[PDB]
Protein backbone atom coordinates (compact mmCIF):
# COMPACT_ATOMS: atom_id res chain seq x y z
CA UNK A 1 0.00 0.00 0.00
CA UNK A 2 2.43 2.68 1.24
CA UNK A 3 6.09 2.12 0.23
CA UNK A 4 5.34 0.93 -3.33
CA UNK A 5 1.92 2.29 -4.38
CA UNK A 6 0.82 5.37 -2.35
CA UNK A 7 4.12 7.01 -1.25
CA UNK A 8 5.35 6.76 -4.85
CA UNK A 9 2.03 7.91 -6.46
CA UNK A 10 2.51 11.67 -5.74
CA UNK A 11 5.16 12.15 -8.50
CA UNK A 12 4.02 9.39 -10.92
CA UNK A 13 0.86 11.58 -10.88
CA UNK A 14 2.92 14.48 -12.31
CA UNK A 15 4.61 12.06 -14.78
CA UNK A 16 1.19 10.81 -15.99
CA UNK A 17 -0.10 14.41 -16.21
CA UNK A 18 2.97 15.56 -18.22
CA UNK A 19 2.55 12.63 -20.66
CA UNK A 20 -1.20 13.35 -21.02
CA UNK A 21 -0.69 17.12 -21.55
CA UNK A 22 2.02 16.29 -24.12
CA UNK A 23 -0.67 15.04 -26.55
CA UNK A 24 -2.60 18.35 -26.33
CA UNK A 25 0.36 20.09 -28.05
CA UNK A 26 2.10 17.45 -30.22
CA UNK A 27 -0.79 15.40 -31.70
CA UNK A 28 -3.11 18.45 -31.81
CA UNK A 29 -3.61 20.26 -35.15
CA UNK A 30 -2.61 17.63 -37.73
CA UNK A 31 -1.03 19.66 -40.56
CA UNK A 32 -2.99 22.53 -42.17
CA UNK A 33 -1.54 26.08 -42.34
CA UNK A 34 -5.19 27.21 -41.90
CA UNK A 35 -5.32 25.82 -38.33
CA UNK A 36 -2.00 27.39 -37.25
CA UNK A 37 -2.88 30.86 -38.62
CA UNK A 38 -6.42 30.81 -37.13
CA UNK A 39 -4.88 30.51 -33.64
CA UNK A 40 -2.68 33.58 -34.33
CA UNK A 41 -5.77 35.82 -34.70
CA UNK A 42 -6.88 34.75 -31.20
CA UNK A 43 -3.46 35.48 -29.60
CA UNK A 44 -3.59 39.07 -30.95
CA UNK A 45 -7.18 39.41 -29.61
CA UNK A 46 -6.05 38.18 -26.16
CA UNK A 47 -3.11 40.66 -26.11
CA UNK A 48 -5.39 43.56 -27.15
CA UNK A 49 -8.32 42.96 -24.75
CA UNK A 50 -7.63 40.25 -22.11
CA UNK A 51 -3.92 40.79 -21.32
CA UNK A 52 -4.34 44.52 -21.94
CA UNK A 53 -1.37 46.73 -22.84
CA UNK A 54 -3.19 49.82 -24.22
Amino acid sequence: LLDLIWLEAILPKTISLAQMKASTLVTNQKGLIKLYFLSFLITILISMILFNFH
Binding site: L2, D3, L4, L7, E8, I10, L11, I15
Partner: protein, 457 residues
Protein backbone atom coordinates in the same frame (compact mmCIF):
# COMPACT_ATOMS: atom_id res chain seq x y z
CA UNK B 1 47.69 18.81 -1.61
CA UNK B 2 44.58 16.82 -2.61
CA UNK B 3 44.29 18.62 -5.97
CA UNK B 4 46.13 16.89 -8.89
CA UNK B 5 46.95 13.47 -7.54
CA UNK B 6 43.42 12.17 -8.28
CA UNK B 7 43.62 14.23 -11.51
CA UNK B 8 47.01 12.50 -12.02
CA UNK B 9 45.24 9.13 -11.51
CA UNK B 10 43.33 9.94 -14.73
CA UNK B 11 46.20 9.52 -17.27
CA UNK B 12 47.62 6.54 -15.28
CA UNK B 13 44.89 4.13 -16.49
CA UNK B 14 45.08 5.27 -20.15
CA UNK B 15 48.90 5.11 -20.41
CA UNK B 16 49.32 1.71 -18.69
CA UNK B 17 49.37 -1.51 -20.77
CA UNK B 18 46.54 -4.08 -21.06
CA UNK B 19 48.25 -6.67 -18.81
CA UNK B 20 48.43 -4.24 -15.86
CA UNK B 21 45.55 -1.68 -15.38
CA UNK B 22 44.15 -3.02 -12.05
CA UNK B 23 47.61 -3.24 -10.42
CA UNK B 24 48.26 0.50 -11.05
CA UNK B 25 44.79 1.86 -10.18
CA UNK B 26 44.83 0.28 -6.69
CA UNK B 27 48.48 0.76 -5.64
CA UNK B 28 48.56 4.44 -6.70
CA UNK B 29 45.41 5.13 -4.65
CA UNK B 30 46.35 3.39 -1.37
CA UNK B 31 49.37 5.70 -0.90
CA UNK B 32 47.08 8.68 -1.71
CA UNK B 33 44.70 7.46 1.05
CA UNK B 34 47.71 7.31 3.42
CA UNK B 35 48.39 11.05 2.91
CA UNK B 36 44.77 12.00 3.78
CA UNK B 37 45.13 10.33 7.20
CA UNK B 38 48.57 12.00 7.52
CA UNK B 39 47.58 15.66 7.01
CA UNK B 40 43.81 16.28 7.47
CA UNK B 41 43.63 14.97 11.07
CA UNK B 42 45.23 18.14 12.53
CA UNK B 43 42.97 20.76 14.16
CA UNK B 44 43.50 23.98 16.15
CA UNK B 45 40.95 25.71 18.38
CA UNK B 46 38.36 26.03 15.58
CA UNK B 47 38.21 25.35 11.81
CA UNK B 48 41.41 25.98 9.82
CA UNK B 49 42.01 27.01 6.19
CA UNK B 50 44.29 24.88 3.99
CA UNK B 51 44.13 27.22 0.96
CA UNK B 52 42.06 29.93 -0.77
CA UNK B 53 38.54 28.71 -1.63
CA UNK B 54 38.93 26.24 -4.49
CA UNK B 55 39.01 23.48 -1.89
CA UNK B 56 38.78 24.92 1.64
CA UNK B 57 39.21 22.93 4.89
CA UNK B 58 37.78 20.54 7.51
CA UNK B 59 35.55 21.50 10.46
CA UNK B 60 33.81 18.21 11.31
CA UNK B 61 34.93 16.07 8.35
CA UNK B 62 36.70 12.75 8.94
CA UNK B 63 34.15 11.63 6.31
CA UNK B 64 36.68 12.74 3.64
CA UNK B 65 39.02 9.95 4.86
CA UNK B 66 36.22 7.38 4.29
CA UNK B 67 35.93 8.32 0.59
CA UNK B 68 39.73 8.05 0.24
CA UNK B 69 39.43 4.64 1.95
CA UNK B 70 36.79 3.57 -0.62
CA UNK B 71 38.99 4.99 -3.43
CA UNK B 72 40.67 1.57 -3.86
CA UNK B 73 37.87 -0.53 -2.25
CA UNK B 74 35.48 -0.19 -5.23
CA UNK B 75 38.26 -1.44 -7.54
CA UNK B 76 38.69 -4.48 -5.23
CA UNK B 77 35.03 -5.54 -5.58
CA UNK B 78 34.73 -5.12 -9.37
CA UNK B 79 37.32 -7.79 -10.26
CA UNK B 80 35.20 -10.84 -11.20
CA UNK B 81 32.84 -8.40 -12.92
CA UNK B 82 34.31 -6.53 -15.95
CA UNK B 83 36.82 -9.37 -16.51
CA UNK B 84 35.24 -10.55 -19.79
CA UNK B 85 34.57 -7.04 -21.22
CA UNK B 86 36.65 -4.79 -23.54
CA UNK B 87 40.02 -3.40 -22.36
CA UNK B 88 39.24 0.14 -23.60
CA UNK B 89 36.00 0.15 -21.55
CA UNK B 90 37.97 -0.91 -18.43
CA UNK B 91 40.06 2.27 -18.84
CA UNK B 92 36.84 4.25 -19.42
CA UNK B 93 35.17 2.85 -16.28
CA UNK B 94 37.94 3.35 -13.66
CA UNK B 95 38.20 7.03 -14.70
CA UNK B 96 34.44 7.41 -14.01
CA UNK B 97 34.94 6.08 -10.46
CA UNK B 98 37.95 8.42 -10.09
CA UNK B 99 35.81 11.37 -11.31
CA UNK B 100 33.18 10.50 -8.66
CA UNK B 101 35.91 10.47 -5.99
CA UNK B 102 37.36 13.68 -7.51
CA UNK B 103 34.13 15.65 -6.89
CA UNK B 104 33.68 13.88 -3.53
CA UNK B 105 37.08 15.20 -2.37
CA UNK B 106 35.93 18.67 -3.53
CA UNK B 107 32.49 18.64 -1.80
CA UNK B 108 33.80 17.66 1.67
CA UNK B 109 36.78 20.07 1.56
CA UNK B 110 35.04 23.12 0.05
CA UNK B 111 33.37 25.18 2.77
CA UNK B 112 30.96 26.93 0.38
CA UNK B 113 27.22 26.61 -0.34
CA UNK B 114 27.54 27.65 -4.02
CA UNK B 115 30.67 25.70 -5.10
CA UNK B 116 29.53 22.74 -2.95
CA UNK B 117 26.09 22.51 -4.63
CA UNK B 118 27.29 22.44 -8.27
CA UNK B 119 29.85 19.72 -7.43
CA UNK B 120 27.22 17.93 -5.30
CA UNK B 121 25.21 17.71 -8.54
CA UNK B 122 28.41 16.81 -10.45
CA UNK B 123 28.35 13.41 -8.68
CA UNK B 124 24.90 12.73 -10.21
CA UNK B 125 26.08 12.42 -13.85
CA UNK B 126 28.87 9.78 -13.35
CA UNK B 127 26.54 7.64 -11.16
CA UNK B 128 23.81 7.85 -13.85
CA UNK B 129 26.21 6.35 -16.45
CA UNK B 130 27.50 3.79 -13.89
CA UNK B 131 23.91 2.65 -13.09
CA UNK B 132 22.44 2.66 -16.65
CA UNK B 133 25.46 0.79 -18.10
CA UNK B 134 26.73 -2.64 -16.88
CA UNK B 135 23.41 -3.21 -15.04
CA UNK B 136 22.86 -6.97 -14.69
CA UNK B 137 19.06 -6.66 -14.32
CA UNK B 138 16.33 -5.41 -16.69
CA UNK B 139 14.42 -2.10 -16.17
CA UNK B 140 17.63 -0.39 -14.94
CA UNK B 141 16.40 2.76 -16.74
CA UNK B 142 13.76 3.35 -14.04
CA UNK B 143 16.67 3.34 -11.54
CA UNK B 144 18.34 5.94 -13.80
CA UNK B 145 15.32 8.19 -14.49
CA UNK B 146 14.08 8.37 -10.87
CA UNK B 147 17.69 9.00 -9.73
CA UNK B 148 17.55 12.40 -11.49
CA UNK B 149 13.77 12.92 -11.15
CA UNK B 150 13.64 12.84 -7.33
CA UNK B 151 17.00 14.58 -6.68
CA UNK B 152 16.98 17.44 -9.25
CA UNK B 153 13.33 18.45 -8.58
CA UNK B 154 14.34 18.93 -4.93
CA UNK B 155 17.85 20.36 -5.47
CA UNK B 156 17.12 23.00 -8.18
CA UNK B 157 15.09 24.85 -5.47
CA UNK B 158 18.54 25.55 -3.89
CA UNK B 159 19.40 27.98 -6.73
CA UNK B 160 16.35 30.12 -5.87
CA UNK B 161 17.18 29.80 -2.14
CA UNK B 162 20.98 30.18 -1.81
CA UNK B 163 21.33 33.12 -4.24
CA UNK B 164 18.36 34.81 -2.46
CA UNK B 165 20.16 34.64 0.94
CA UNK B 166 23.47 36.10 -0.37
CA UNK B 167 21.57 38.91 -2.15
CA UNK B 168 20.08 39.92 1.23
CA UNK B 169 22.97 39.12 3.64
CA UNK B 170 26.59 39.61 2.44
CA UNK B 171 27.71 36.35 0.79
CA UNK B 172 27.53 32.64 1.69
CA UNK B 173 30.89 31.84 0.04
CA UNK B 174 33.49 31.52 2.84
CA UNK B 175 31.08 30.20 5.57
CA UNK B 176 33.40 31.37 8.41
CA UNK B 177 32.65 34.79 6.91
CA UNK B 178 28.93 33.99 7.34
CA UNK B 179 28.46 35.06 10.95
CA UNK B 180 26.54 38.16 9.84
CA UNK B 181 23.59 35.78 10.46
CA UNK B 182 20.32 37.52 11.32
CA UNK B 183 17.67 35.42 13.17
CA UNK B 184 14.79 34.33 10.90
CA UNK B 185 11.60 36.12 12.03
CA UNK B 186 9.25 33.24 10.97
CA UNK B 187 7.28 34.78 8.09
CA UNK B 188 5.27 33.13 5.27
CA UNK B 189 7.95 34.15 2.74
CA UNK B 190 10.56 32.46 4.98
CA UNK B 191 8.49 29.22 5.02
CA UNK B 192 9.52 28.22 1.47
CA UNK B 193 13.05 29.58 2.08
CA UNK B 194 13.55 26.94 4.80
CA UNK B 195 11.76 24.20 2.80
CA UNK B 196 13.82 24.65 -0.40
CA UNK B 197 17.08 24.38 1.57
CA UNK B 198 15.87 21.18 3.29
CA UNK B 199 14.02 19.35 0.45
CA UNK B 200 17.30 19.08 -1.52
CA UNK B 201 18.72 17.03 1.38
CA UNK B 202 15.42 15.23 2.13
CA UNK B 203 15.95 13.10 -1.01
CA UNK B 204 19.57 11.91 -0.54
CA UNK B 205 18.90 11.60 3.20
CA UNK B 206 15.92 9.20 2.87
CA UNK B 207 12.80 9.93 4.95
CA UNK B 208 9.55 7.94 4.83
CA UNK B 209 8.18 10.03 1.95
CA UNK B 210 10.37 10.54 -1.17
CA UNK B 211 12.41 7.45 -0.13
CA UNK B 212 11.80 5.27 -3.25
CA UNK B 213 14.92 6.92 -4.77
CA UNK B 214 17.14 4.53 -2.74
CA UNK B 215 15.87 0.89 -3.10
CA UNK B 216 15.39 1.11 -6.90
CA UNK B 217 19.05 2.20 -7.21
CA UNK B 218 20.11 -0.85 -5.13
CA UNK B 219 17.79 -3.57 -6.55
CA UNK B 220 18.66 -2.44 -10.09
CA UNK B 221 22.31 -2.25 -8.99
CA UNK B 222 24.96 -0.37 -11.06
CA UNK B 223 27.35 -3.37 -10.90
CA UNK B 224 26.34 -6.57 -9.01
CA UNK B 225 27.41 -5.42 -5.51
CA UNK B 226 30.54 -3.39 -6.30
CA UNK B 227 29.50 0.15 -7.32
CA UNK B 228 26.83 0.23 -4.58
CA UNK B 229 29.56 1.66 -2.27
CA UNK B 230 29.36 4.88 -4.34
CA UNK B 231 25.60 5.01 -3.57
CA UNK B 232 26.53 4.62 0.13
CA UNK B 233 28.74 7.71 -0.39
CA UNK B 234 25.71 9.53 -1.86
CA UNK B 235 23.75 8.72 1.33
CA UNK B 236 26.44 10.43 3.45
CA UNK B 237 26.72 13.01 0.62
CA UNK B 238 23.80 14.84 2.25
CA UNK B 239 26.08 16.34 4.92
CA UNK B 240 25.05 19.89 3.87
CA UNK B 241 22.20 19.48 6.38
CA UNK B 242 24.85 19.85 9.14
CA UNK B 243 25.86 23.24 7.66
CA UNK B 244 22.48 24.69 6.54
CA UNK B 245 20.64 24.11 9.87
CA UNK B 246 23.59 25.52 11.88
CA UNK B 247 24.35 28.66 9.82
CA UNK B 248 21.44 29.69 7.54
CA UNK B 249 18.46 29.22 9.91
CA UNK B 250 19.05 28.71 13.68
CA UNK B 251 15.99 30.56 15.08
CA UNK B 252 13.12 29.12 13.00
CA UNK B 253 12.96 25.35 13.62
CA UNK B 254 9.18 25.10 14.14
CA UNK B 255 9.02 23.70 10.58
CA UNK B 256 11.61 21.06 11.57
CA UNK B 257 9.06 19.61 14.04
CA UNK B 258 6.84 17.89 11.38
CA UNK B 259 9.93 16.57 9.52
CA UNK B 260 11.24 14.72 12.61
CA UNK B 261 7.75 13.18 12.94
CA UNK B 262 7.80 12.13 9.26
CA UNK B 263 11.21 10.48 9.78
CA UNK B 264 10.01 8.86 13.05
CA UNK B 265 7.69 6.61 11.01
CA UNK B 266 10.63 6.39 8.59
CA UNK B 267 12.20 4.30 11.37
CA UNK B 268 9.46 1.74 12.20
CA UNK B 269 7.58 1.34 8.88
CA UNK B 270 10.84 1.26 6.86
CA UNK B 271 12.08 -1.55 9.15
CA UNK B 272 8.78 -3.48 8.98
CA UNK B 273 8.97 -3.86 5.15
CA UNK B 274 12.58 -5.04 5.65
CA UNK B 275 11.50 -8.44 7.04
CA UNK B 276 9.66 -10.34 4.27
CA UNK B 277 11.36 -9.11 1.05
CA UNK B 278 13.05 -11.69 -1.19
CA UNK B 279 16.02 -9.71 -2.58
CA UNK B 280 19.14 -9.87 -0.37
CA UNK B 281 20.29 -6.44 -1.62
CA UNK B 282 16.87 -4.94 -0.81
CA UNK B 283 17.25 -6.24 2.77
CA UNK B 284 20.30 -3.95 3.00
CA UNK B 285 18.63 -1.17 0.94
CA UNK B 286 15.66 -0.72 3.31
CA UNK B 287 17.85 -1.11 6.42
CA UNK B 288 20.01 1.73 5.05
CA UNK B 289 16.90 3.98 5.09
CA UNK B 290 16.44 3.52 8.87
CA UNK B 291 20.11 4.01 9.89
CA UNK B 292 20.31 7.21 7.80
CA UNK B 293 16.92 8.35 9.18
CA UNK B 294 18.67 8.58 12.59
CA UNK B 295 20.70 11.57 11.32
CA UNK B 296 17.59 13.43 10.01
CA UNK B 297 15.98 13.02 13.47
CA UNK B 298 19.24 14.22 15.12
CA UNK B 299 20.15 17.32 13.02
CA UNK B 300 16.71 19.02 13.25
CA UNK B 301 16.84 18.94 17.09
CA UNK B 302 20.09 21.00 16.77
CA UNK B 303 21.33 20.05 20.29
CA UNK B 304 25.16 19.63 20.67
CA UNK B 305 24.73 15.92 21.55
CA UNK B 306 22.93 15.09 18.28
CA UNK B 307 25.83 16.44 16.15
CA UNK B 308 28.24 14.10 18.00
CA UNK B 309 25.98 11.12 17.23
CA UNK B 310 25.25 12.17 13.63
CA UNK B 311 28.89 12.69 12.51
CA UNK B 312 29.70 9.29 14.04
CA UNK B 313 26.73 7.68 12.22
CA UNK B 314 27.82 9.14 8.84
CA UNK B 315 31.16 7.29 9.20
CA UNK B 316 29.52 4.26 10.91
CA UNK B 317 27.02 3.61 8.08
CA UNK B 318 29.65 4.29 5.38
CA UNK B 319 31.72 1.27 6.45
CA UNK B 320 29.03 -1.13 7.76
CA UNK B 321 26.32 -1.00 5.06
CA UNK B 322 28.96 -1.00 2.29
CA UNK B 323 30.49 -4.12 3.90
CA UNK B 324 27.03 -5.78 3.75
CA UNK B 325 26.86 -5.02 -0.01
CA UNK B 326 30.21 -6.83 -0.42
CA UNK B 327 28.61 -9.92 1.17
CA UNK B 328 25.71 -9.55 -1.28
CA UNK B 329 28.29 -9.30 -4.10
CA UNK B 330 29.98 -12.58 -3.06
CA UNK B 331 26.63 -14.43 -3.14
CA UNK B 332 25.50 -12.91 -6.47
CA UNK B 333 28.75 -13.79 -8.32
CA UNK B 334 28.11 -17.53 -7.69
CA UNK B 335 24.31 -17.99 -7.97
CA UNK B 336 23.51 -15.05 -10.36
CA UNK B 337 20.16 -14.34 -8.65
CA UNK B 338 19.85 -12.38 -5.38
CA UNK B 339 17.00 -14.53 -3.98
CA UNK B 340 17.51 -15.10 -0.23
CA UNK B 341 15.45 -18.34 -0.17
CA UNK B 342 17.52 -19.91 -3.00
CA UNK B 343 20.99 -18.97 -1.67
CA UNK B 344 20.84 -20.87 1.64
CA UNK B 345 23.80 -22.43 3.47
CA UNK B 346 27.08 -21.22 4.98
CA UNK B 347 29.96 -23.20 6.61
CA UNK B 348 29.25 -26.25 4.39
CA UNK B 349 30.81 -24.34 1.46
CA UNK B 350 31.93 -21.01 3.00
CA UNK B 351 33.50 -21.57 6.48
CA UNK B 352 35.71 -18.45 6.80
CA UNK B 353 33.15 -16.05 5.25
CA UNK B 354 30.61 -16.99 7.99
CA UNK B 355 32.72 -15.20 10.65
CA UNK B 356 32.88 -12.12 8.38
CA UNK B 357 29.08 -12.37 8.00
CA UNK B 358 28.85 -12.00 11.81
CA UNK B 359 31.27 -9.05 12.06
CA UNK B 360 29.16 -7.21 9.44
CA UNK B 361 25.58 -8.11 10.45
CA UNK B 362 25.96 -7.59 14.23
CA UNK B 363 27.42 -4.09 13.58
CA UNK B 364 23.88 -3.01 12.54
CA UNK B 365 23.10 -3.72 16.21
CA UNK B 366 24.88 -1.97 19.09
CA UNK B 367 27.88 -4.28 19.71
CA UNK B 368 30.81 -3.62 22.08
CA UNK B 369 31.49 0.05 21.09
CA UNK B 370 32.67 0.12 17.47
CA UNK B 371 31.19 3.39 16.09
CA UNK B 372 27.55 2.31 15.53
CA UNK B 373 26.71 2.21 19.27
CA UNK B 374 28.66 5.48 19.75
CA UNK B 375 26.64 6.82 16.79
CA UNK B 376 23.22 5.61 17.97
CA UNK B 377 23.43 6.02 21.78
CA UNK B 378 24.21 9.77 21.64
CA UNK B 379 21.21 10.32 19.31
CA UNK B 380 18.79 8.40 21.61
CA UNK B 381 20.11 10.39 24.61
CA UNK B 382 19.61 13.58 22.54
CA UNK B 383 15.98 12.72 21.67
CA UNK B 384 15.06 12.48 25.39
CA UNK B 385 16.00 16.15 25.96
CA UNK B 386 13.76 16.92 22.96
CA UNK B 387 10.85 14.78 24.31
CA UNK B 388 10.47 11.93 26.84
CA UNK B 389 8.14 9.78 24.66
CA UNK B 390 10.75 9.22 21.88
CA UNK B 391 12.38 6.09 23.41
CA UNK B 392 9.04 4.21 23.12
CA UNK B 393 9.29 4.79 19.33
CA UNK B 394 13.10 4.34 19.33
CA UNK B 395 12.90 1.11 21.36
CA UNK B 396 10.83 -0.69 18.69
CA UNK B 397 13.63 0.15 16.21
CA UNK B 398 16.16 -1.50 18.57
CA UNK B 399 14.15 -4.76 18.35
CA UNK B 400 13.92 -4.73 14.51
CA UNK B 401 17.69 -3.99 14.20
CA UNK B 402 18.10 -7.51 15.63
CA UNK B 403 15.50 -8.59 13.04
CA UNK B 404 17.87 -7.09 10.44
CA UNK B 405 21.05 -8.97 11.39
CA UNK B 406 19.85 -12.36 12.69
CA UNK B 407 17.33 -12.82 9.85
CA UNK B 408 20.21 -12.29 7.40
CA UNK B 409 22.21 -14.86 9.41
CA UNK B 410 19.51 -17.55 9.98
CA UNK B 411 18.49 -17.61 6.28
CA UNK B 412 22.18 -18.33 5.53
CA UNK B 413 22.83 -20.62 8.56
CA UNK B 414 20.27 -23.21 7.38
CA UNK B 415 22.56 -25.94 6.01
CA UNK B 416 21.07 -27.39 2.83
CA UNK B 417 22.10 -26.04 -0.64
CA UNK B 418 20.75 -29.11 -2.47
CA UNK B 419 20.06 -27.49 -5.88
CA UNK B 420 23.39 -25.60 -5.92
CA UNK B 421 26.15 -27.28 -7.95
CA UNK B 422 28.18 -24.04 -8.19
CA UNK B 423 30.03 -22.16 -5.37
CA UNK B 424 32.63 -24.97 -5.34
CA UNK B 425 35.64 -22.70 -4.77
CA UNK B 426 35.44 -21.01 -1.31
CA UNK B 427 37.00 -17.52 -1.73
CA UNK B 428 39.70 -15.65 -3.65
CA UNK B 429 42.52 -13.70 -1.92
CA UNK B 430 40.92 -10.38 -2.99
CA UNK B 431 37.46 -11.65 -1.92
CA UNK B 432 38.48 -12.05 1.75
CA UNK B 433 40.47 -8.78 1.47
CA UNK B 434 37.19 -6.84 1.04
CA UNK B 435 35.93 -8.44 4.27
CA UNK B 436 39.10 -7.35 6.12
CA UNK B 437 39.60 -3.82 4.67
CA UNK B 438 36.01 -2.88 5.66
CA UNK B 439 35.89 -4.41 9.17
CA UNK B 440 39.44 -3.78 10.51
CA UNK B 441 39.08 0.04 10.29
CA UNK B 442 35.86 -0.38 12.33
CA UNK B 443 37.83 -2.57 14.78
CA UNK B 444 40.58 0.08 15.04
CA UNK B 445 37.93 2.76 15.74
CA UNK B 446 36.79 0.76 18.82
CA UNK B 447 39.87 1.99 20.73
CA UNK B 448 39.71 5.78 20.19
CA UNK B 449 37.14 7.32 17.77
CA UNK B 450 38.01 10.86 18.96
CA UNK B 451 39.01 11.73 15.37
CA UNK B 452 35.66 10.40 14.06
CA UNK B 453 32.87 12.03 16.11
CA UNK B 454 34.36 15.54 16.13
CA UNK B 455 32.19 18.64 15.82
CA UNK B 456 34.06 20.43 18.67
CA UNK B 457 34.73 17.29 20.75
Amino acid sequence: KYIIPTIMLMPLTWLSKNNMIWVNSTAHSLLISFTSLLLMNQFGDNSLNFSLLFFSDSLSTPLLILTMWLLPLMLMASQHHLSKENLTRKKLFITMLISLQLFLIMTFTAMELILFYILFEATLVPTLIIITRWGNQTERLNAGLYFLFYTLAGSLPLLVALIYIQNTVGSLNFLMLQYWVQPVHNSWSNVFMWLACMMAFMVKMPLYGLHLWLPKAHVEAPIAGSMVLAAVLLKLGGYGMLRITLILNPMTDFMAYPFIMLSLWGMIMTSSICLRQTDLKSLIAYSSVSHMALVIVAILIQTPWSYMGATALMIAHGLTSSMLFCLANSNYERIHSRTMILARGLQTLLPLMATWWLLASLTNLALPPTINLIGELFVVMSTFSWSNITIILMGVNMVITALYSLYMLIMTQRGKYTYHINNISPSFTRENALMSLHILPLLLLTLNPKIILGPLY
